[PDB]
Design a protein around this nucleic acid. Structure first.
Ligand code: FES
Ligand SMILES: [K+]
Ligand SMILES: [K+]
Ligand SMILES: [Mg+2]
Ligand SMILES: [Mg+2]
Ligand SMILES: [Mg+2]
Ligand SMILES: [Mg+2]
Ligand SMILES: [Zn+2]
Lengths: 53, 197, 54, 126, 294, 74, 170, 108
RNA sequence: AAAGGUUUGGUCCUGGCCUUAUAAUUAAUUAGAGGUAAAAUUACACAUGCAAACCUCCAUAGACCGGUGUAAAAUCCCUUAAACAUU
């Protein structure tokens, strides 16, 4: 073989993306915040099930 | 629209013993003196689909179709034998005898039906019995001791039957699912109710 | 008890192997008893939601 | 395909033609296609009654016991087949569904009797 | 109690093999099948005799008799009766264990009926499904139609009894009622028309002689063996009749007179022969021809 | 089937869950059947797990396995 | 005419006549033989006739042949344990050489039959699937079962087209 | 020609030139110089035995030496030196045949 | 291939091309219905709709199924080791 060549951009992308995750980890106050008028989580827009209202 | 009517329709085997057959065919097969008309030296691998369409006959009728008195019936064994190899017992393919595909399929069914009823002989290989041991004392083919629940008449497992829930537990569910409830169901019928008809 | 077919296969093997007995095969449920469905689960091994806003 | 995650499962693979279904009982990684790559064939199921009026199930009970012992899950249709055979206990919903059918035929019979009684009133009116 | 002789008893197999006979031309008659070009070897008289010896060894294995068994007993065992499933199914389910390394007579084949009963499969059901999943060359899933009484009579007119029996061995099990019915019908037709020669030098002769001895109708086979100058075989048949019926008047008469050879056949004629008058006439004629010519 | 990066439909934004209604007598009977059924099936799955491992050890280090190994060397 | 001398050596039937299947220990078989002489004639025939058959049944064994390196012909087998089995084939017929090596380092008939049976353990006659792997593709082929709709049309009541129409009518 | 001779079952292949005269001369040259079984028994003094697969291991004696039967077995080599035709062997080696081979043809 | 046609004044040799068999697609002309299988110009550009949810909040899933043949002689079979976003 030997025509398979390195992928520097792919390696750089994987590492670089990892750094952003570690620094920009969200917090419990943000992930689990809720809008009680609509019963929907603002961070992700997830609407709670009906049996939990 | 008037195809000829054979006198031997009821008893087809009679024709092959009549003098008319002997004069026309002698002791050779009925397909011996037939040649197919085709371009080239190698013929097509299938014969014509059929020689008779809506009471009309094709240009070069095949051995069966050209002679109307010849009848392909499982009982007419003498005719059927001409289409089976005497040495190998394999039915000849349609190109071999020049019969049309319709009659070849019809002949194959008659040959197989004659063999199934024993009118037409074929070679039966000798095969050993299926099982080396012929004992019938294993539980699979014998009597298994009846289970305790089976003798008493009870279900195999207790939860197979309907067990009325405790009254407190039914109320616990009425609180949990308050506002979205269905009419409470009692014990189901003991047997399957006979289907109304 | 064992299921009806699986019980018959056990009794058949006994007779084939020469073991003569009328004991009823029994399943033991103590080793594999299930927790309630609402039992608290292991939070340490649970996933956490990602930090990409929708 | 090169799957990542998943478990072995025993399920029914649909075969046959249109209006003529036939199933192959197989052990396969759950992420594989229904009729695609499988690990072992453990039997077959013909859901159409034959000339003798019998639906024919074939179970390789030695290999089935082997794969359940190695973590193989079971699909719900296969649990119903193992329950009818007697190799497994009857599935909870097999029992519940049979009870629902009994309660639903009980109503129909009662309605027919009421209709006959209503028809009897029509007979009384003449 | 003196054990009743069996079909596979070394003594019975010896007598049945002898009366059956061997004929390398009949045992190895050409099969009507796809043919291949023959091969040729140059052999001395020593090599040729060695080849004939191997042919006789193979003819012995080819003439191995098929088992003679008593009719199986119907399977009627109910594993369970789950009435909750009554009315939830319209057709019976048949479940077959198809594990490869289980003998077929030790496999579990159960039926879940619409009523909910889980029962063991009958003998007819067991053979049918075992053909569907372990297909045997020669056997068909559904019983063939050649075994109908009218179809069997056609085969008998053509003197195709060895085929009727070879077909009955490929299709049916030895202990099945269909197997016994067909065999007992073929053996009976051979008797009525004196066609004993059809099954000689075949694996089916032993069962035929066995059936006649047990049914006390060896008269025809003795008369035919004597008329063919096979009088050593006829005596062995009377020994087999004196072995399976020890308390019979004929067997007790031979002990009193210590009869041997042709004497045994003469004793049978007077005591237990259904048609003794003919056995003596045929036996006498054989002796006259043998003595007169030689 | 859609990928996680695909945009959601605009005809199903209004969608809200409609939980099934519960029959108290049948829900409880069914909950118990599932608990007892799954315990029986867990007892059978364990027995099958042991037959697999017993057979494996017999093949690996059974009586017959050991004799053949030494028989070959001799 | 097939080229070369004894062209039968280049037929699959001849190559399959070999009976020497080496044990798993055998890894290499070096052949030292002489091209000229009278006591090495059997060795020369063994290289000519038998070495092809041995390699055919033992594809993973390295057979390397050396010519005119020693006064006498011999065979030396190298086993996986590190043992070296020297065999002396001088004044020995090619048939004698084959039988000798079969005895000392050849698998027995019993062992080979067990492997053949084990190889086919996962083929089941009941299994349905493609012709390459299975006898029957579908249960429609079995006698007594419902036939394939393509070959034989199904009854109207067993068809989804018909059942759907009734549900609309109801 | 085979019909005129009376041969009913045979296979033949012709290659090289298709000259009709050379084929007729070549055919009669080969058919008229063949060795019957009775001749082979006399030349070697041994029995000629036939083994058909449809008759099993049954040995069939087709020709016996006219004079004195020998007692020295014919030498049977371990590996014969026969000269083989690639066309004949090619089929048995598993090589795919031509689309024109063994086609369905009318009875000859 | 069981072969055939075709160089010449003629015969023979050599040697190509073509024919006869089988199939797929498109096209011309032609045709009733029914069962079945298959569906295929283009990795060109795309209006519109739909194709992933579930669920007492957490999680899990949307990494599959489905699609195409872009790239690369890229692969097959085999050995060893370790894992899994698993059971
Ligand atoms: S191939 Fe079996 S139903 Fe069509
Ligand atoms: K040419
Ligand atoms: K067109
Ligand atoms: Mg939860
Ligand atoms: Mg078109
Ligand atoms: Mg896919
Ligand atoms: Mg490309
Ligand atoms: Zn015709």
């Amino acid at each position: 073989r030997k025509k398979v060549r390195p992928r520097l951009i792919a390696e750089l992308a994987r590492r670089v993306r990892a750094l952003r995750e570690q620094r920009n980890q969200p917090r419990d106050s943000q992930l689990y915040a809720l809008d009680y008028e609509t019963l929907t989580r603002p961070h992700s827009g997830r609407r709670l099930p009906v049996r939990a209202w | 629209s008037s195809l000829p009517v054979s006198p031997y329709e009821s008893e087809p085997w009679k024709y092959l013993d009549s003098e008319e057959y002997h004069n026309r065919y002698g002791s050779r097969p009925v397909w011996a003196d037939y040649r197919r008309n085709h371009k080239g030296g190698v013929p097509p691998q299938r014969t014509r689909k059929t020689c008779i369409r809506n009471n009309k006959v094709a240009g070069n009728p095949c051995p069966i179709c050209r002679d109307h008195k010849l009848h392909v019936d499982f009982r007419n064994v003498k005719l059927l034998e001409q289409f089976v190899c005497a040495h190998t017992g394999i039915i000849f393919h349609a190109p071999y005898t020049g019969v049309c595909m319709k009659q070849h399929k019809k002949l194959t069914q008659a040959i197989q039906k004659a063999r199934e009823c024993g009118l037409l002989s074929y070679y039966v290989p000798q095969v050993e019995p299926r099982d080396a041991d012929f004992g019938t004392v294993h539980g699979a083919v014998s009597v298994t001791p009846p289970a305790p629940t089976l003798l008493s008449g009870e279900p195999w497992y207790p939860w197979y039957s309907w067990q009325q829930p405790p009254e407190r537990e039914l109320s616990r569910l009425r609180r949990l699912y308050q506002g979205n409830l269905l009419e409470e169901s009692g014990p189901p019928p003991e047997s399957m109710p006979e289907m109304p008809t | 008890p064992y299921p009806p077919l699986l019980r018959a296969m056990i009794l058949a093997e006994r007779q084939k192997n020469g073991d003569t007995s009328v004991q009823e095969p029994l399943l033991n449920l103590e080793r594999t008893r299930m927790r309630p469905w609402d039992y608290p689960a292991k939070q340490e091994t649970k996933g956490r939601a990602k930090g990409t806003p929708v | 395909k090169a799957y990542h995650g998943g478990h072995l499962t025993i399920r029914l693979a649909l075969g046959g033609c249109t209006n003529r279904p036939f199933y192959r009982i197989v052990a396969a990684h759950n992420k594989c296609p229904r009729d695609g790559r499988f690990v072992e064939q453990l039997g077959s199921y013909d859901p159409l009654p034959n000339s003798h009026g019998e639906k024919l199930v074939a179970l390789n009970l030695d290999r089935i016991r082997h794969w359940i012992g190695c973590g193989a899950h079971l699909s719900k249709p296969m649990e119903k087949l193992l329950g009818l055979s007697g190799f497994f206990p009857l599935h909870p919903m097999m029992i519940t569904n049979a009870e629902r059918l009994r309660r639903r035929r009980a109503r129909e019979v009662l309605l027919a009797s009421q209709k006959a009684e209503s028809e009897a009133k029509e007979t009384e009116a003449s | 109690e003196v054990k009743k002789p069996a079909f596979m008893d070394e003594e019975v197999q010896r007598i049945l093999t002898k009366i059956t006979g061997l004929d390398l031309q009949k045992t190895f008659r050409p099969a009507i099948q796809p043919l291949k070009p023959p091969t040729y070897k140059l052999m001395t008289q020593a090599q040729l005799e060695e080849a004939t010896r191997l042919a006789v060894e193979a003819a012995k294995v080819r003439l191995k008799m098929p088992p003679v068994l008593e009719e199986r007993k119907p399977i009627n065992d109910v594993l369970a009766e789950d009435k909750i499933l009554e009315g939830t199914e319209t057709n019976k389910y048949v479940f077959t264990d198809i594990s490869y390394n289980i003998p077929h007579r030790e496999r579990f084949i159960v039926v879940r009926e619409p009523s909910g009963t889980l029962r063991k499969a009958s003998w007819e059901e067991r053979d049918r499904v075992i053909q569907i999943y372990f297909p045997k060359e020669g056997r068909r899933v559904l019983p063939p139609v050649i075994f109908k009484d009218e179809n069997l009579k056609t085969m008998y007119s053509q003197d195709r009894h060895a085929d009727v029996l070879n077909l009955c061995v490929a299709q049916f099990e030895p202990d099945s009622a269909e197997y016994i019915k067909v065999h007992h019908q073929t053996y009976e037709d051979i008797d009525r028309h004196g066609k004993y020669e059809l099954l000689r030098s075949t694996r089916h002769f032993g069962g035929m002689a066995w059936y006649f001895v047990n049914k006390k109708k060896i008269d025809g086979l003795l008369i035919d063996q004597i008329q063919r100058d096979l009088v050593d075989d006829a005596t062995s048949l009377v020994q087999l009749y004196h072995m399976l019926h020890p308390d019979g008047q004929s067997a007790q008469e031979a002990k009193e007179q210590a009869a041997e050879g042709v004497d045994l056949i003469k004793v049978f004629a007077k005591t237990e022969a259904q048609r003794g008058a003919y056995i003596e006439l045929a036996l006498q004629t054989y002796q006259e021809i043998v003595t007169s010519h030689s | 089937r859609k990928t996680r990066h695909d945009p959601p439909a605009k005809s199903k934004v209004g969608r809200v869950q409609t939980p099934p209604a519960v029959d108290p007598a049948e829900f409880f009977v069914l909950t118990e059947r599932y608990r007892q059924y799954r315990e029986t099936v867990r007892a059978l799955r364990l027995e099958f797990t042991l037959e697999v491992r017993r057979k494996l050890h017999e093949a690996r280090a059974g009586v017959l396995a050991e004799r053949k190994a030494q028989q070959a060397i001799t | 005419p097939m080229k070369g001398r004894f062209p039968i050596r280049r037929t699959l039937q001849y190559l399959g006549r070999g009976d020497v299947v080496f044990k798993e220990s055998v890894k290499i078989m070096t052949v030292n033989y002489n091209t000229y002489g009278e006591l090495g004639e059997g060795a020369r025939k063994f290289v000519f006739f038998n070495i092809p058959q041995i390699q055919y049944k033992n594809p993973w064994v390295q057979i390397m042949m050396f010519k005119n390196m020693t006064p006498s012909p011999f065979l030396r087998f190298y086993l996986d344990s590190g043992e070296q089995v020297l065999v002396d084939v001088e004044t020995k017929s090619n048939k004698e050489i084959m039988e000798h090596i079969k005895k000392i380092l050849g698998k027995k008939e019993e062992t080979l039959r067990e492997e053949e049976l084990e190889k086919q353990q996962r083929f089941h006659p009941g299994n349905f699937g493609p012709r390459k792997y299975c006898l029957r593709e579908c249960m429609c082929e079995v006698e007594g079962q419902v036939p394939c709709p393509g070959l034989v049309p199904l009854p109207k009541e067993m068809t989804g087209k018909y059942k759907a129409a009734l549900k609309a009518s109801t | 020609i085979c019909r005129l001779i009376g041969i009913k079952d045979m296979y033949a292949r012709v290659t090289g030139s298709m000259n009709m005269l050379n084929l007729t001369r070549g055919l009669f040259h080969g058919l008229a110089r063949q060795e019957t079984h009775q001749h082979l028994a006399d030349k070697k003094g041994l029995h000629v035995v036939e083994f058909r697969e449809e008759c099993g291991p049954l040995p069939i004696v087709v020709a016996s030496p006219h004079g004195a039967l020998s007692k020295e077995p014919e030498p049977e080599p371990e590996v014969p030196d026969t000269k083989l035709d690639w066309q004949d062997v090619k089929a048995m080696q598993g090589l795919k045949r031509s689309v024109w081979f063994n086609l369905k043809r009318p009875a000859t």
